[PDB]
Amino acid sequence: HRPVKRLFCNIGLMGPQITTKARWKPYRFATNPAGTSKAERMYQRDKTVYTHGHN
Amino acid sequence: FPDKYRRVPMLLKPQQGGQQYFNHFLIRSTNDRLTQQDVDNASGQAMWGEMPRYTSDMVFLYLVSRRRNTYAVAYTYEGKRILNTYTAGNRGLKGGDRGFRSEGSTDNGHQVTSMYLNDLLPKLREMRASEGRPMGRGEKVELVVRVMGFYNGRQGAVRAVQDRANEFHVRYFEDIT
Amino acid sequence: TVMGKPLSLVLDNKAWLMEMVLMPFDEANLDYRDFDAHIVSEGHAMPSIANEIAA
Amino acid sequence: NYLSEQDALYLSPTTPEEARVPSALCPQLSACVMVVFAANDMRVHDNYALALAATRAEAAGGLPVIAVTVVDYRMFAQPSAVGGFFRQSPMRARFFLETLAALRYKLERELRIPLLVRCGRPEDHIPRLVVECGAIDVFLTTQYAPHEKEVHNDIVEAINQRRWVSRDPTAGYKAIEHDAAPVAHSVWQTTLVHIDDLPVPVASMVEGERWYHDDVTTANIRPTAAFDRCINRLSDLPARGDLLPTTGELSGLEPPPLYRGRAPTLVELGYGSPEAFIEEEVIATQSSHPPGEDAAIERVLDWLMDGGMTSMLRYGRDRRTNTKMYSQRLSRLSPYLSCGALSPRRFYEELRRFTSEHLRDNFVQQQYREALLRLSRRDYWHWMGLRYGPLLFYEYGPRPEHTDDIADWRHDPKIVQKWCAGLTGIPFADAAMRELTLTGFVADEGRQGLIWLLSRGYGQDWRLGAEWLERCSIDYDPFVCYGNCAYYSELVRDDFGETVRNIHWLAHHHDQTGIYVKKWLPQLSKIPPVYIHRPHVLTERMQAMHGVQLGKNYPYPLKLWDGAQYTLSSEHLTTYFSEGSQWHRKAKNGAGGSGYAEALRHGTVILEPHQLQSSAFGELEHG
Amino acid sequence: VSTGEFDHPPFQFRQRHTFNTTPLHDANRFGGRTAYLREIGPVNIKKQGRRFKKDPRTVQFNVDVWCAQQTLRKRWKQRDWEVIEIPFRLVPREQQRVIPELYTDIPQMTDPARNDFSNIRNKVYDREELQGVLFPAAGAMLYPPLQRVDKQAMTLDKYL
Amino acid sequence: NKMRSKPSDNVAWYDKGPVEWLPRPVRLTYDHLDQLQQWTMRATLDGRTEEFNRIRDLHREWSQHPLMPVLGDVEPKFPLNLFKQNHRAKKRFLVRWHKANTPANWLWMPRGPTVVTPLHRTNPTQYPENWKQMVQ
Amino acid sequence: NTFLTSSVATPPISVIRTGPKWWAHPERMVRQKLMYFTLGVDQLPLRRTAVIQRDLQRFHMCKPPPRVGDSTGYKRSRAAQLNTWYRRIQYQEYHMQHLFTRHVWGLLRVYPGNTTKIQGKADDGYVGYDSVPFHRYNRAPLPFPARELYERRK
Amino acid sequence: TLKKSLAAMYMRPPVTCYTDACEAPVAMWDGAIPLKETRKLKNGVPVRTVSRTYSHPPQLTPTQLSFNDINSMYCVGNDELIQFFPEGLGGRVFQTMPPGHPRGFLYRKETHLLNLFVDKVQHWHTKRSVLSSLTNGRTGFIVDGPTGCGKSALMCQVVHFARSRNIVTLYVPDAKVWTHGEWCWPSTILPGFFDAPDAARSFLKYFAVANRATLTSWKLRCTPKDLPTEQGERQPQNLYELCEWGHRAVAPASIDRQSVCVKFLMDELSEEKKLPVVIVVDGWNLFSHETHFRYPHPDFLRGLASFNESSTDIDLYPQELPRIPASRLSFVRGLNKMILSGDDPNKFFITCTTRDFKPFDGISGFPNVETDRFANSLDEYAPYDPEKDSHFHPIQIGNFDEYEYRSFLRFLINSGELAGLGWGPLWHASSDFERKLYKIGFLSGRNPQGVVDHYHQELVWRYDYQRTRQKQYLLKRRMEGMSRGAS
RNA sequence: CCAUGAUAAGGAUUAUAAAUUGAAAGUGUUAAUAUCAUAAUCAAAAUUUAUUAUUUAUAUUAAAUAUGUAUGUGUAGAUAAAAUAAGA
Numbered sequence A: 001h002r003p004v005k006r007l008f009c010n011i012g013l014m015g016p017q018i019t020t021k022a023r024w025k026p027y028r029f030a031t032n033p034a035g036t037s038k039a040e041r042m043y044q045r046d047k048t049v050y051t052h053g054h055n
Numbered sequence B: 001f002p003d004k005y006r007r008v009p010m011l012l013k014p015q016q017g018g019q020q021y022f023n024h025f026l027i028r029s030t031n032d033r034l035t036q037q038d039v040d041n042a043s044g045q046a047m048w049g050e051m052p053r054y055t056s057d058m059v060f061l062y063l064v065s066r067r068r069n070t071y072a073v074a075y076t077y078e079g080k081r082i083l084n085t086y087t088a089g090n091r092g093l094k095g096g097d098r099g100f101r102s103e104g105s106t107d108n109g110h111q112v113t114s115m116y117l118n119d120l121l122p123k124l125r126e127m128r129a130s131e132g133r134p135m136g137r138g139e140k141v142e143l144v145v146r147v148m149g150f151y152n153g154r155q156g157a158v159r160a161v162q163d164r165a166n167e168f169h170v171r172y173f174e175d176i177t
Numbered sequence C: 001t002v003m004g005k006p007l008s009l010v011l012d013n014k015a016w017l018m019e020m021v022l023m024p025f026d027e028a029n030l031d032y033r034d035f036d037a038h039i040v041s042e043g044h045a046m047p048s049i050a051n052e053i054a055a
Numbered sequence D: 001n002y003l004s005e006q007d008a009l010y011l012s013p014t015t016p017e018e019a020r021v022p023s024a025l026c027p028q029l030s031a032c033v034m035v036v037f038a039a040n041d042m043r044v045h046d047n048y049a050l051a052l053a054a055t056r057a058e059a060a061g062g063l064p065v066i067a068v069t070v071v072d073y074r075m076f077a078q079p080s081a082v083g084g085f086f087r088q089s090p091m092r093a094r095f096f097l098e099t100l101a102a103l104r105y106k107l108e109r110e111l112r113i114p115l116l117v118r119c120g121r122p123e124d125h126i127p128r129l130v131v132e133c134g135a136i137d138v139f140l141t142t143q144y145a146p147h148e149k150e151v152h153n154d155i156v157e158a159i160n161q162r163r164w165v166s167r168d169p170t171a172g173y174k175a176i177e178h179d180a181a182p183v184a185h186s187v188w189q190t191t192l193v194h195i196d197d198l199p200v201p202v203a204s205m206v207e208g209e210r211w212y213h214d215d216v217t218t219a220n221i222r223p224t225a226a227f228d229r230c231i232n233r234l235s236d237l238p239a240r241g242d243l244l245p246t247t248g249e250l251s252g253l254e255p256p257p258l259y260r261g262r263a264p265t266l267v268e269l270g271y272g273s274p275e276a277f278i279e280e281e282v283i284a285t286q287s288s289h290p291p292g293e294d295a296a297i298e299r300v301l302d303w304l305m306d307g308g309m310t311s312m313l314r315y316g317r318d319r320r321t322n323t324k325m326y327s328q329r330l331s332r333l334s335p336y337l338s339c340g341a342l343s344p345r346r347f348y349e350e351l352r353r354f355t356s357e358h359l360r361d362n363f364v365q366q367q368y369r370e371a372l373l374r375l376s377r378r379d380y381w382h383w384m385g386l387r388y389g390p391l392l393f394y395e396y397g398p399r400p401e402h403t404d405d406i407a408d409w410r411h412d413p414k415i416v417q418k419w420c421a422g423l424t425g426i427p428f429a430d431a432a433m434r435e436l437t438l439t440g441f442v443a444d445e446g447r448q449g450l451i452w453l454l455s456r457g458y459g460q461d462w463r464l465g466a467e468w469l470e471r472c473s474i475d476y477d478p479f480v481c482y483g484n485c486a487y488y489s490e491l492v493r494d495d496f497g498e499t500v501r502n503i504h505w506l507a508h509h510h511d512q513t514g515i516y517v518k519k520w521l522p523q524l525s526k527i528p529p530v531y532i533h534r535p536h537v538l539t540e541r542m543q544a545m546h547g548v549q550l551g552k553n554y555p556y557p558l559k560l561w562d563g564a565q566y567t568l569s570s571e572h573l574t575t576y577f578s579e580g581s582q583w584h585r586k587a588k589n590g591a592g593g594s595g596y597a598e599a600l601r602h603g604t605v606i607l608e609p610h611q612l613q614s615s616a617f618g619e620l621e622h623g
Numbered sequence E: 001v002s003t004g005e006f007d008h009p010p011f012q013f014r015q016r017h018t019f020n021t022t023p024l025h026d027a028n029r030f031g032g033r034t035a036y037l038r039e040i041g042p043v044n045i046k047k048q049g050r051r052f053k054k055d056p057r058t059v060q061f062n063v064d065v066w067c068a069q070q071t072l073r074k075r076w077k078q079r080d081w082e083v084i085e086i087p088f089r090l091v092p093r094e095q096q097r098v099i100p101e102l103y104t105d106i107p108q109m110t111d112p113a114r115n116d117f118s119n120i121r122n123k124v125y126d127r128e129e130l131q132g133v134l135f136p137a138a139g140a141m142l143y144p145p146l147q148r149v150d151k152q153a154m155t156l157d158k159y160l
Numbered sequence F: 001n002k003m004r005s006k007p008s009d010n011v012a013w014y015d016k017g018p019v020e021w022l023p024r025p026v027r028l029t030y031d032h033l034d035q036l037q038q039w040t041m042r043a044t045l046d047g048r049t050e051e052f053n054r055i056r057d058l059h060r061e062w063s064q065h066p067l068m069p070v071l072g073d074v075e076p077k078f079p080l081n082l083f084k085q086n087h088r089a090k091k092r093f094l095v096r097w098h099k100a101n102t103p104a105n106w107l108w109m110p111r112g113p114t115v116v117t118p119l120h121r122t123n124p125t126q127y128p129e130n131w132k133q134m135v136q
Numbered sequence G: 001n002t003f004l005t006s007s008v009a010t011p012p013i014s015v016i017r018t019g020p021k022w023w024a025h026p027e028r029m030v031r032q033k034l035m036y037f038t039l040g041v042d043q044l045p046l047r048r049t050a051v052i053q054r055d056l057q058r059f060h061m062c063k064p065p066p067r068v069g070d071s072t073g074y075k076r077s078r079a080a081q082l083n084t085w086y087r088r089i090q091y092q093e094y095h096m097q098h099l100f101t102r103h104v105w106g107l108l109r110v111y112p113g114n115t116t117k118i119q120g121k122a123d124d125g126y127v128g129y130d131s132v133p134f135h136r137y138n139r140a141p142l143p144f145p146a147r148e149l150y151e152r153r154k
Numbered sequence H: 001t002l003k004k005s006l007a008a009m010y011m012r013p014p015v016t017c018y019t020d021a022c023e024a025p026v027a028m029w030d031g032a033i034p035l036k037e038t039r040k041l042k043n044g045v046p047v048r049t050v051s052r053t054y055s056h057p058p059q060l061t062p063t064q065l066s067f068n069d070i071n072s073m074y075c076v077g078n079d080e081l082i083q084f085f086p087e088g089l090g091g092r093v094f095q096t097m098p099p100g101h102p103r104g105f106l107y108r109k110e111t112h113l114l115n116l117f118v119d120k121v122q123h124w125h126t127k128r129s130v131l132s133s134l135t136n137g138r139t140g141f142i143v144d145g146p147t148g149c150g151k152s153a154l155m156c157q158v159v160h161f162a163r164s165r166n167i168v169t170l171y172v173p174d175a176k177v178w179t180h181g182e183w184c185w186p187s188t189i190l191p192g193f194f195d196a197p198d199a200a201r202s203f204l205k206y207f208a209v210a211n212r213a214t215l216t217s218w219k220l221r222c223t224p225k226d227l228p229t230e231q232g233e234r235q236p237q238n239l240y241e242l243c244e245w246g247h248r249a250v251a252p253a254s255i256d257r258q259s260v261c262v263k264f265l266m267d268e269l270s271e272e273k274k275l276p277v278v279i280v281v282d283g284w285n286l287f288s289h290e291t292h293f294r295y296p297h298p299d300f301l302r303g304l305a306s307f308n309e310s311s312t313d314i315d316l317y318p319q320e321l322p323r324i325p326a327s328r329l330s331f332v333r334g335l336n337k338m339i340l341s342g343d344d345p346n347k348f349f350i351t352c353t354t355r356d357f358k359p360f361d362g363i364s365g366f367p368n369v370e371t372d373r374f375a376n377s378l379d380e381y382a383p384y385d386p387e388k389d390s391h392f393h394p395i396q397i398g399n400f401d402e403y404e405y406r407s408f409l410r411f412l413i414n415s416g417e418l419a420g421l422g423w424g425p426l427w428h429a430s431s432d433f434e435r436k437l438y439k440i441g442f443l444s445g446r447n448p449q450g451v452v453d454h455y456h457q458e459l460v461w462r463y464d465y466q467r468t469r470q471k472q473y474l475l476k477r478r479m480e481g482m483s484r485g486a487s
Numbered sequence I: 001c002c003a004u005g006a007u008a009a010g011g012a013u014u015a016u017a018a019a020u021u022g023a024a025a026g027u028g029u030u031a032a033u034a035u036c037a038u039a040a041u042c043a044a045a046a047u048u049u050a051u052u053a054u055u056u057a058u059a060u061u062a063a064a065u066a067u068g069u070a071u072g073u074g075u076a077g078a079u080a081a082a083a084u085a086a087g088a
C-alpha cells in the first residue's frame, strides 16, 4: 500500500485526489496476500512469528 | 434541589421579544375600537309489601367476598346448582405473584366473577334447553344478585356483574350480613 | 464587521447566530442598514467564535 | 446431494487414499480402542464409555484411544411425520455443531485424543471405520429411543459380524478385505440413577412420579471420581500424533484432512433460505447458553453461587408455589443435560456439595430435595418412555384407555400455523411461544401451557405440538418431551400426580402481575393487570387508551367467544397467512416462513415423501 | 478566521460510534492522520499498548504539527510569484527606498502621497513590464506586451 | 470479563419497513447533497421521472400528520425501585419497547390507501410532468 | 459514506430527548431540509419538529407554572397528551430522515456503515471491512472484496 | 366560515404550460397564498369567483423578453430546458429548481444586454461594426465577480438565448471537470498535449444532441475520409455524425476516438468564417492557469528491472512535479488557437470566472467532514485578474440591489409555497414577507447565493416574535369581541 | 514504631412588587488513615508483582530503553456521579 500510494502520487496523472477523493483499504486488510477472497484471513496468519502484523 | 438557572436574570428567564410590535398593536386597537364605535352609532341611527316477588325464570347469584378469597355461585329457582363455585384458589389467583394482601382484591373479584359468568352462560343455556325451554336469539336472563362479605372484592364482583348487561339483567340487588 | 471581517464570515453564515446580532435593531425599532458597527475581540482569541454564547 | 457425495467419498468399495486413516508407525499402535460419541453424551468428565475404554487400553498396554462421531444426517433435514415440520431446526443445529466442536477441542487439545467427525448413516460409517482402524474394543452408550435404538442395534450387530459397507446399493460385506474379533461394549449412562441399581425393576415398576421419587429416596447414585481417575490416566496412554490437527488446521487456513472429517454447515445439512428462519422479535430474556462442557460446569457453579437455589423453592416455604418465568435465577441446565455435555451425576454431586457447605442454613435441604426430585422426574420420564416403547409416539398417546373424553383430533394447517407462530389471543401462551422460538428454551409452565393449548384447547393433534417443541427446544429429549406432551394433553392420565391445569389458570397463577407477558410483548405494557390475559375484552375506548389495537397488533384469539360472527367482520378479523401477507413475502423466492410443512417448503434434501405431506403442500398452494 | 478544528479531542471513556459521537481515532478526523495514533482493537492495558498514543501532550503536538503543515501548504498554494534580486537601480520609485525588514517596523505603504496605501511587502509585479530588466540580452519578443482594456471606451458594459 | 454469545438488543430487523428498525446512525454531508443535486439534474434532463414518482409515493405514504392521542395514552415509564440505580434494566426495557414499537405498527400515523390525504397528488399523472395531458 | 465502521443503535426517544445539540441542531436540520428540497418533496414533519423545538427551547429557561393550581385530573392528562403528540411527530420526522437518507444513499451509490440496510439493493444490511469476519446478526461469512453493491462505471 | 367557503369554492385555472401545471393542492398553500373573490365577466355578467392573490411568473421566450422585463422574474418550460441545456446548468444554478418547483430566472440589465448581443450575433455579417464597437475589438466578453453572484446563471441565460435563435453554441457548464478532472491522458495525435477523456466525451455527446439541427447541415471541410470505423457503422459526413462517431464507442477505444474527434472538431470550427459560433465556458479562470494535474515522473517513461539499484525514488518519496498548464489541453489549445489567431470575426467567447475556491484566511485546520459546505470546492487559493489573464472584455457583476433581491426572494418564497415546498399549513409559524425580506437581506448582504442559503436556513430562526405577538393580539381581540357580544 | 492532627462522607435558608444587570456554595460528627510532641533492635534501591475512571478498522516505531496480546451480535450482577454555560 505505501509504495502503491507513493507511485500514484509521483505519477501525478491522478493529481491531488489520492488523499482527498481516493479511498484505500485499511492497514491489516491491505496487507493480505494476493488471493484471499475471505475476510477471515488476517486471523489465519501465523501467530508464533513476532512480526507486528507482517506475516 | 437548587435552582438550575439561578445565575440567569429574571428578565432573561424568559426574555420578552417583539417590543416594537406593542405600539403598533395599541394603535391598531385604538383604530378598531374607533371604527366599532362608528358602526355602532351607524346602527343606532339606522311476604308482601316491599319484599320482592320472585319469578321461576330468575337465577339467584351469590357473591361472597372474604378477607383473602372470593366466591361466585349460581342457583336456579328450583334450587339446583347451575355451575360449581368459582374461587380465587380455584382460578389460581391466590397462588402468588401478588402477595397475600392482594388476595380478595377488587380486580381479583372482578375477574373471578367475569370468568364464572362467562362459563355460566353456556351452562345456563344447556340447563334451560334440557327441559325444552329455549333461551331465544336475544339472551336476556334475569338474575337476583346477593352480595355478602363487605370486602374489596365485592366492588369488583358487582362491577363484573354490571358488565355484560346485554346478556344478564339484574332484577334485585340484596345484601346479606 | 467583526475583527476586520464581515459578520457573515465571522459567524460562518449561520442565521441562528447572526439573528442575535440583528435583534437589537429590531427591538429598538430601527434599521440595521443605517449604522456601521465594528466588533473588537478582547477575550480569548479563537479561530472560530461561531457559537451561541459568543453570539 | 451432500449426503450422496459423502457416501460416494467415504462408503466406497475402494476407499481412496485421501479418505483413508493413516497407519501408525509403531507396530504396537496399529491396533487401538475406539469410542463412539453421540447426541446423548458429548462430555469427557463423566463418560462411562470413555472410562471403560481407558481401562481396557491400560489393561491391554499402550493401546491408543480413538474417538468417532457420525452425525445423523436424517435428523437435521428430514421433515416431521405430521405437519411437515423441521427436525433439528437451524437454531438447534447450530448449538449441536458448536457442542460437537467444543467436544472435539476438548479431546484433541486437552486429552490429545483425535476425534473423527463423519456425516451420513451412523450404522454404515461406524462399522466400516472399525474395520479400517482395526479397533479391538468399541465402547459406546446405549441408545434406547426409536431411530436411535435400532441404529445402535445395527451398529453393534455389524461390529460383532465384522461387516464392511458400500453405499451405491445398501450392501454389506465380510471383513476378509479391508482395502482380531472386535467386541462392542454398550454402557448405560443416560439416567441419573444407573440401571441395575433401581430398587424396583422397570418391568414391575408402578407407573407413578411420586412412587419413583420414593424409590430414588432409597436408591444410590454412582460417584464420578472413579471415572475421573480413568479419564486422567488416559493421558499417560500413547497417542497417534499423525491423526491430530495441525496449527494451520486449527487456525482454519486449510480444511481438515479428508480422512479426519469436515464439520457440516446449515446448507450442507439441507437448510435452505435462512432469511425465512430469522425471527425478528424482542428477546426479553438476558441469559444465554454457551455451548460446551467447561461452560456448562461454569454455569452450574454460577447458578449455585448467585443464589439460584431459590428458583426450586422459595426460602422457608416447604410447599411449591408459582414460578417466576421472567427471572434469570433459574437453572437453564436442561440443554446441557439433554445433550450429554453435563452429566446428571456431576450435577448431583455439585448440588450435594453446595448443600453440605451451606447446611448451616435451615432450608437448603428442602431445595436440594426439590432439585433431586426434578432430576428423578427426568429419569422417571425416561423409564416411562422405555415402558411405553413405540406406543409413546402413536395417536391418542400410548394408553387409549384414558382417552374416552378425547375428540377425533381435528387438524387444521392454518390453526397450527398460528399456534406455532404465536399468533393467538392468550398473552401467556404468546410470550411462552415467543421465548421458545427465539431463545430455543422456555420454562416448564410455558411448555405445559403451549402443549395443552394446542392439544386440548384447540382440538388439534398432539403430535403436531410435540414435533414443533422438538423442532424449537434446544433441550429436546425424545422421552421426556413426548411423555410430558402426552401427560399434559390428557392422554396419559396417571393418578397421584400433577394436575393438568388450564392455560388461563397458569396465566393467573404464574403470571398474575403480568411481568413476563409485558416483557416478552412490550406492546401490551399499558394494559392493567386486571385486563391482561384477556385483552380482547377491552372496548374501543379502553384499547385506544392503552395503545393496543386488536387486529392491527396482537390479533383476536383463535377461539372466539360465543357469537362473534355477527358483531365482527373481515375488517376486524385480520388474516395472517393469505396470498398478500408478509409470511408469503419471504425466502427470497416466496414460499413462507416457519411453520406447517416448512421442511417441504424450504428443505433441499427430502427423503421418502408422504401422501399427507403432498396433499398438505397442494392445499397450501391452493390457499 | 477558520472553521476546522485544531485541538485533539480529550481522552475519556471509550467513544462508541453513534449519533453525535465518533471513535476518538476514527479515520475521518484530521483527514486521515488519526491512523498514526490509532491503537486498533481492544487493548489490555497491563501489557498491550503504546504509551505515546495515550499521552495527551504528544498527540496534541502531533495534531499541531499536522495543522502547521496544512497551513504551510495552503499558504504556499497562494504563491503565484517568485522573489528575484534586482540591483536596486532598475526598480521603480516605489521600491527605491529603505524597506524595513519583516517584523521590525509598522506595516509600510507604497507611496501614500500617490493615494496608494497597500502593503509594500505584498506587492507583486508582473513580468510584462519587467522583461526589459530581467532579460536584457535575450531581447526579441518574449512575453508579448500585456493588452490593457481601455476604461474610457463605449463598450457593452457601459450600456452603449 | 465474561464472554457471552447472547444476541444483544442491538440486533437489526431487516424485514420490517424499508429502513431497519433501531437504525444505524447516518452522516449526511454536503458532498452527498451536491451529488444528489447533480444526479437530479441529470435525471430531469434525461426525462426519467420514475424515481421522482417513487420518492413522491414514499413521502405521501410516510409523511402524514399523526393523530391526537386520547387522554391516558402515554408511553410506559420505568418504576422507581429502591435497589439503587437499575440503569441497565431501564436501558433494556426502553430498547425492548422501542424495538417492539416498529414503524409499521405505528397506529398514530395514517398510512394506507383507505385514508385520504388532502395535501399531496395521488398519482404521477397529476404532477406537472403531464402538463400536456391536462389542456383545454 | 466516509463513515464505514461498526455502529451502535439508540432508541428514538433518546435522540428526541437530546434537544438543540444533535436532534435540533440548526445546521443538521438545514441539511435535512436541503435533502428534502433537492428531492422536491414537502418538509412538513421537519417544519413541525422545528417549530416544536423552537417553542421548547425558547421557554426551557422559564420555571414551570405551579402544579398545585393545575388540576391533576385534567391538566396533567392534557399535558401528557400534548407531550406524547409532540413526541410522535418527532418520531415521524426521525423515521422520515432515516428513510430518505437510505434512499439517497442507494441513488448516489453511497456505501453505508456496517449492518446498515438500504432497501432495494441490500435488504439485509450491508457490511464491509468489519472487525468480525462473519456478518453480524446473520452469521454469513464475508469475502475480502466485501460487496460490489452498484455497477462499476462512474 | 368565509375562508372555508373560499377554499371549497376555489377552482384551479386552466393549465397552459409546465409552469401553470406545477401547483400544490388547495389545502397545502391555503394559508401561505391567500385567496380573494374577484368578479369576472365570463358571459358579460361579473360572476364572483375565488382566485389566488399570487401566480407563478410568466413563461416568456427570449424573443418575448424586452426592456420592460428587466428586474423581473420569468419562467422556462421543462421541455425547453431539456432541449436547450443537454449539458446541464451551472455549478449551483440548478439548486433552486427541483422537479416540482418551476424553473425561473431573473432578467437583469446584463442579461438584457447579452440578449441583445446574441440577437445581433444572430446576423453578425450585417452588425459586424456595432458588435466590434460593443466588444472594443475583443473576441467576446468575460464575466467576473465575487462568489455567489449571478455569474453561472447569466451564462445559462446566454446559452438559452443562443440556443433559442438556432446558433451553434459550445457550452462548458463546469470548467472544473476539464482542469480538475478525474484523470488526465496524453493526446494520441497531438505531441506534447493532454486532454480529459471523461469531460471531452460528455462534451462531444451533449454538443451533438444540442446542435443536431445545425451540425447535420454543417459540411466537413478539414477532415480525413479514412477515419477508423467499425463494421456496419456509416462514415461521418456531418459534424453531428463526427461527434456521434467520437463519443459513441466501446471502451477503451472511445478514449482515442475522443482525442481525435476533439482535434478535428476544433479544426472544423476554426475553418468556418460565415456562421456565427458562440462559445460559453463557465469558469474560464481555470483554463487561464495550470490544471491540478502534474507531469509524470520521468522514471515511469524508461522502465526498471528492480527498485534496489536503479537510481530512482518514485517508490520511496512522493514529490510534486510542475503542474500541467491548461494551455496544453487539446480542448483549450483549440480555443486559444481560435482566440489568438486573427481572421475569426464569427466566433464569440462569452465566458465567466468561478470563485468557488476553498476558504483560507491565515490558518487552515482540518475541516469537519460531517459539516463542510466546501467538500467539492476547488483547492486553488489563487488570485485572478481578468484584465491581465484574459483576451476578452471584462464585465464586472456585483451582488443584487434592492429591486432584484426583492423580486428574487418573492419568487422563491411564493413559488415554493405554491409548489408545495414551503411552510404550507405551517405558514403562520414564520413571519410575513416584509420581515423575511428585511432579515434575509441582513443575513445575506444581497448576495444571491446567500439569499438562497438563508431562505433555506429560515427554518431554524429562533428570535422572530412577530407571529407570536400577533397570535396573542388576535386572541386578545377575539376575547374582547366575545365579551362585547355577550354584554 | 511518633498518636496525634488533618482529611474522607457530608447536609442548613431569607431575598413582595417595581427598578437594577442585578442582590447571592455552606459545616458537625461518625469513620478510616497517617510521614507530627510523646514507649531500643531495625523498608526504600538488587524493584515481577498483580495497586477503579484506556487509543476499535482510508494511510500506523526518527533521537534519553519506552510494551505481542482480550476481534467475537457490545450481551450480567452490583457500584459511583450530577440538577453548576448550558439547553429533565
Ligand SMILES: Cc1cc2c(cc1C)N(C[C@H](O)[C@H](O)[C@H](O)COP(=O)(O)OP(=O)(O)OC[C@H]1O[C@@H](n3cnc4c(N)ncnc43)[C@H](O)[C@@H]1O)c1[nH]c(=O)[nH]c(=O)c1N2
Pocket (backbone or CB within 6 Å): D330, D331, D332, D333, D334, D335, D337, D338, D374, D375, D377, D378, D379, D381, D442, D443, D444, D445, D447, D448, D451, D469, D473, D475, D476, D477, D478, D480, D481, D482, D484, D485, D488
Ligand atoms: C410439553 C413439555 C415438553 C417438555 C418438557 C415439559 C413439557 C410440559 N420438559 C420438562 C421441563 O419443561 C424441563 O425439564 C424444564 O422446564 C427445564 O427448565 P430448567 O432447566 O430451568 O429446569 P430446572 O432448573 O429445574 O433444571 C433441573 C433439571 O431437572 C430436569 N427437570 C426439571 N423439570 C422437569 C420436568 N418437569 N420433567 C422432566 N425433567 C425435568 C431437567 O433435566 C432440568 O435440567 C422437557 N425437559 C427436557 O429436558 N427436554 C424436553 O424436550 C422437554 N420437553
Ligand SMILES: Nc1ncnc2c1ncn2[C@@H]1O[C@H](COP(=O)(O)OP(=O)(O)OP(=O)(O)O)[C@@H](O)[C@H]1O
Pocket (backbone or CB within 6 Å): H090, H091, H092, H093, H094, H095, H096, H104, H105, H106, H107, H108, H145, H146, H147, H148, H149, H150, H151, H152, H153, H154, H353, H354, H355, H356, H448, H449, H452
Ligand atoms: N438571474 C438569476 N436568476 C435566477 N437565479 C439566479 C440568478 N442569478 C443568480 N441566481 C441564483 O444564484 C445561485 C448561485 O448563482 P451562480 O451559480 O451564478 O453563482 P456564481 O457567481 O457563478 O458562483 P461561484 O463563484 O461559486 O461560481 C443559484 O441558486 C442561482 O439560481
Ligand SMILES: [Mg+2]
Pocket (backbone or CB within 6 Å): H090, H091, H092, H151, H152, H282, H353, H354, H355
Ligand atoms: Mg459559478
